[PDB]
Scaffold this motif. Structure first.
Motif, mmCIF file in Angstrom:
data_model
loop_
_atom_site.group_PDB
_atom_site.id
_atom_site.type_symbol
_atom_site.label_atom_id
_atom_site.label_comp_id
_atom_site.label_asym_id
_atom_site.label_seq_id
_atom_site.Cartn_x
_atom_site.Cartn_y
_atom_site.Cartn_z
ATOM 1 N N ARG A 94 -11.635 86.168 81.061
ATOM 2 C CA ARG A 94 -11.427 84.728 81.171
ATOM 3 C C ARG A 94 -10.220 84.284 80.356
ATOM 4 O O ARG A 94 -9.444 83.431 80.787
ATOM 5 N N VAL A 95 -10.064 84.880 79.179
ATOM 6 C CA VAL A 95 -8.892 84.704 78.336
ATOM 7 C C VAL A 95 -7.893 85.768 78.769
ATOM 8 O O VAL A 95 -8.203 86.959 78.733
ATOM 9 N N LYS A 96 -6.710 85.342 79.193
ATOM 10 C CA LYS A 96 -5.791 86.248 79.880
ATOM 11 C C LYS A 96 -4.675 86.783 79.002
ATOM 12 O O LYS A 96 -4.017 87.751 79.371
ATOM 13 N N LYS A 97 -4.502 86.193 77.823
ATOM 14 C CA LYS A 97 -3.505 86.660 76.867
ATOM 15 C C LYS A 97 -4.146 87.741 75.992
ATOM 16 O O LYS A 97 -4.567 87.480 74.855
ATOM 17 N N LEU A 98 -4.225 88.947 76.546
ATOM 18 C CA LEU A 98 -4.924 90.072 75.920
ATOM 19 C C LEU A 98 -4.297 90.443 74.589
ATOM 20 O O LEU A 98 -5.012 90.852 73.673
HETATM 21 CL CL LIG Z 1 -5.413 82.724 78.022
#
Ligand SMILES: [Cl-]
Ligand SMILES: CO[C@@H]1O[C@H](CO)[C@H](O)[C@H](OC(=O)c2ccc(C)cc2)[C@@H]1OC(C)=O
Length: 138
Positions: free
Chosen positions: A112-116
């Motif tokens: 869901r959070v895409k900035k790994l």
């Molecule tokens: Cl994100």
């Protein structure tokens, strides 16, 4: 023998093929375990075994953004037992976190959070004795 709650830094965030291994023992009469992959104050992935939710055992997975929890994903398969040693492995894949417990696949959680690269801390808490927390690349 590590202190709980335990913060494991993940330098430069997570990346596919990163494998995180947590070894510990569940305390007798445990209520909860939580692994929290954090992006600053946000929780990208909350993995939360609950030993007594309305007299049921369930694993709850969720994401917290700007102090608000999202839609829960629940798993009724519950491999933990009070008093017993466990191994949790979290494998980061391109589109999800993959979780295995005691060498058996348990669940996947879509990112869901895409900035790994900004998911730079893992918090480990709850009713456990923590033996080891480490990571490697596979
Ligand atoms: Cl994100
Ligand atoms: C909708 O209830 C909430 O569901 C969320 C997942 O959808 C979280 O599990 C949250 O718990 C916590 O944030 C939390 C953090 C630290 C401690 C010591 C206890 C709870 C809370 O669950 C419960 C059980 O309150």
């Amino acid at each position: 023998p590590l202190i709980v709650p335990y913060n494991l830094p993940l330098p430069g965030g997570v990346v596919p093929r990163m494998l995180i291994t947590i070894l510990g023992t569940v305390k007798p009469n445990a209520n909860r375990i939580a692994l929290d992959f954090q992006r600053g104050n946000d929780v990208a992935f909350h993995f939360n075994p609950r030993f007594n939710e309305n007299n049921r055992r369930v694993i709850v997975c969720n994401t917290k953004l700007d102090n608000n929890w999202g839609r829960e994903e629940r798993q009724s398969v519950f491999p933990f037992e009070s008093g017993k040693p466990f191994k949790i492995q979290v494998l980061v894949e391109p589109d999800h976190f993959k979780v295995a417990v005691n060498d058996a696949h348990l669940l996947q959680y879509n990112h869901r959070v895409k900035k790994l690269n900004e998911i730079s801390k893992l918090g480990i808490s709850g009713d456990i004795d923590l033996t080891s927390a480490s990571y490697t690349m596979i």
